[PDB]
């Protein structure tokens, strides 16, 4: 059950608090950052590719 999960998450919920967030590339429910709408794994790989502007590996 994954396409049904994604479709139900995209639909308008019955109540406002029913709504949750999923990663927009892979429909993953946990660990979704909401500046990027990306889960941690997709975030990491896209950041390594260089396709997320501004972000770079943090040395400090």
Partner 1 sequence: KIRIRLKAYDHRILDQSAEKIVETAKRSGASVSGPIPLPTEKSIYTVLRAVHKYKDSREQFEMRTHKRLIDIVNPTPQTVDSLMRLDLPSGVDIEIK
Partner 2 sequence: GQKVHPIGMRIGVIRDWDSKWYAEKDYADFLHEDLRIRDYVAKRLSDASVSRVEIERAANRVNITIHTAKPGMVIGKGGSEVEALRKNLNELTQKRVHINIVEIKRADLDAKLVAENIARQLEGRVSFRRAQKQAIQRTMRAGAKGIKTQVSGRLGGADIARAEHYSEGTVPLHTLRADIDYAWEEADTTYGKLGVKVWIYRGE
Partner RNA sequence: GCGAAGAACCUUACCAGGUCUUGACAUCCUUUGACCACUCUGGAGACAGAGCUUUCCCGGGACAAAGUGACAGGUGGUGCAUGGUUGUCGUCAGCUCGUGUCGUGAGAUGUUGGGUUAAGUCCCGCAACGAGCGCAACCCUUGAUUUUAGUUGCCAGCAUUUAGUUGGGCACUCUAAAGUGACUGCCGGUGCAAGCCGGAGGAAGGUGGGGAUGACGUCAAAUCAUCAUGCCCCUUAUGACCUGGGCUACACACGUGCUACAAUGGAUGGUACAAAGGGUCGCGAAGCCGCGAGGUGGAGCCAAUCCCAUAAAACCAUUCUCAGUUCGGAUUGUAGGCUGCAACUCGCCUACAUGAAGCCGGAAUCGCUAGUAAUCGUGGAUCAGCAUGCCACGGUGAAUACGU
Task: Using CB under 8 A, list all residues that contact partner 2.
Answer: 24-25, 34-38, 46-54, 56-57
The option from partner 1, Zn ion, Mg ion, none interacting with 47 (CB < 5 to 8 A, set by class) reads: partner 1
Confirm whether residue 23 is marked as ligand binding.
yes
Binders of partner 1 among 5-34, rule CB under 8 A? 31, 33
- Contact (CB, 8 A) for 16 and 41: no
Instruction: Compute φ and ψ for 39, nearest 5 degrees.
Output: -65, 170
Residues 6+ apart with CB under 8 A from 29: 20, 21, 22
Contact stretch for partner 1 (CB under 8 A) within 8-16, 20-28, 52-60: 52-60
């Amino acid at each position: 059950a994954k396409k049904s999960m994604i479709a139900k998450q995209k639909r308008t919920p019955k109540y406002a608090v029913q709504a949750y967030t999923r990663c927009e590339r892979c429909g993953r429910p946990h660990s979704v950052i909401r500046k990027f709408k990306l889960c941690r794994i997709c975030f990491r790989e896209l950041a390594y590719k260089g396709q997320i502007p501004g972000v770079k590996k943090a040395s400090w």
